[PDB]
């Protein structure tokens, strides 16, 4: 499920003891995999073939001792003795018996605090709660005061704006009377200067 199923690292075997894939340029040697499968047998077929680990029989008594001392480990050891342990079975055994590292808080040295100070812990917590109570209430109080004040700014900005509305209103009245009554408006007055 990673890298397309290609293992990042894998074992390759060569039949010729003096073979070097970098020095030689021959075209007859066929590499094998970790289980010994020749490269010309595709993965889809070889992965179906069942491969099991065979330990020398002299190890059976040791594998038996392991099972008895740890009964949860016995089924895996039995498979290994009987030549029924595949790579997947080995992986299941490996991860089943892995445990996490443990941290003990009782071993941590503590920052220095006198016995007088240690007896005041409840008092300091009490002060902290009252500070949080006063903080939360003040938030409501302040929000009401300042957002209400912003209305004064709206009203002040509406008064000052209305002053320019009135000036504009009077301006339009004046403009309507310019071409109609204003003596400043003159017709048949400007004469062409002519080219210099």
């Amino acid at each position: 499920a990673y890298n397309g199923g290609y293992p990042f690292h894998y074992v390759v075997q060569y039949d010729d003891p003096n073979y070097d894939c970098e020095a030689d340029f021959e075209f007859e040697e066929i590499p094998r995999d970790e289980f010994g499968v020749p490269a010309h047998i595709p993965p889809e077929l070889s992965t179906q073939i069942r491969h099991t680990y065979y330990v020398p029989p002299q190890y059976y008594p040791f594998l038996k001792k392991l099972g008895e001392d740890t009964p949860e480990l016995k089924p895996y050891t039995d498979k290994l003795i009987m030549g029924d342990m595949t790579y997947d079975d080995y992986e299941e055994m490996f991860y089943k018996f892995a445990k996490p590292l443990k941290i003990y808080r009782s071993r941590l040295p503590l920052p220095y605090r006198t016995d007088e100070e240690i007896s005041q812990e409840k008092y300091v917590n009490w002060c902290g709660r009252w500070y949080s109570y006063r903080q939360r209430l003040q938030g409501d109080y302040y929000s009401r005061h300042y957002f209400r004040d912003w209305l004064i700014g709206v009203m002040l900005g509406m008064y000052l704006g209305n002053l320019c509305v009135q000036q504009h209103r009077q301006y339009r009245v004046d403009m309507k009377l310019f071409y109609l009554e204003a003596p400043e408006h003159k017709i048949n007055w400007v004469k062409p200067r002519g080219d210099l």
């Binding site: 009252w130 209430l137 003040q138 109080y141 008064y159 000052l160 002053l163 009135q166």
Partner: protein, 121 residues
């Protein structure tokens, strides 16, 4: 109104005066301001009020001017910029006499309206 209706666990001062106290102060000198309104050497702690005796949560308010001059100081004991005055003395007065507050505010607004309208028109 924080002490009056919202929070009952802060000390509540008495209003010495609804007007600021004018005092000459000198740079490099530390002044102590009465936060309870019961000192007889206003605006300063007299050594006999609540602030001086550290009674009922009242403590003197330390203050120091940057430059020499005449500075306004809070008499209402609730100004936001206490010990200095910023107008909270008038605001607190309006809370206590809302009818008077309206009269002054109307008069101030009336003058402001006339002048701004007279000049712009």
């Amino acid at each position: 109104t924080w002490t009056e209706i919202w929070w009952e666990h802060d000390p509540t001062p008495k209003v010495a005066q609804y007007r600021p106290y004018v005092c000459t102060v000198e740079s490099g000198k530390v002044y102590w301001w009465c936060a309870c309104g019961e000192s007889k050497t206003q605006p300063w702690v007299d050594g006999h009020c609540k602030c001086s005796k550290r009674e009922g949560g009242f403590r003197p308010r330390r203050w120091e001017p940057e430059h020499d001059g005449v500075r306004l100081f809070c008499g209402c004991k609730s100004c936001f910029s206490s010990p200095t005055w910023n107008g909270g003395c008038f605001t607190k007065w309006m809370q206590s006499n809302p009818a008077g507050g309206m009269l002054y505010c109307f008069a101030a607004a009336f003058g402001f309206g006339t002048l701004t309208v007279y000049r712009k028109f």
